[PDB]
């Protein structure tokens, strides 16, 4: 039943992981982070980039 992302909903569809090991969210739904295809290289979520 765990929830993730900035939307705090259960996992579904394609999800991307934040590369900051101290990220409190860790996983996000592609659409919630405006992703259609997985990006190339490391990826950091909005929260960690603007921390």
């Amino acid at each position: 039943e765990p929830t993730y992302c900035l939307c705090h909903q259960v996992s579904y569809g394609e999800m991307i992981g934040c590369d900051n090991p101290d990220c409190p969210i860790e996983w996000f739904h592609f659409a919630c982070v405006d992703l259609t295809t997985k990006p190339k290289g490391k990826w950091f979520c909005p929260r960690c980039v603007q921390e």
């Binding site: 579904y12 569809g13 999800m15 991307i16 590369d19 997985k38 490391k42």
Partner: peptide, 7 residues
């Protein structure tokens, strides 16, 4: 980037 498909 690391991604996964919800099972």
């Amino acid at each position: 980037a690391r991604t996964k498909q919800t099972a």
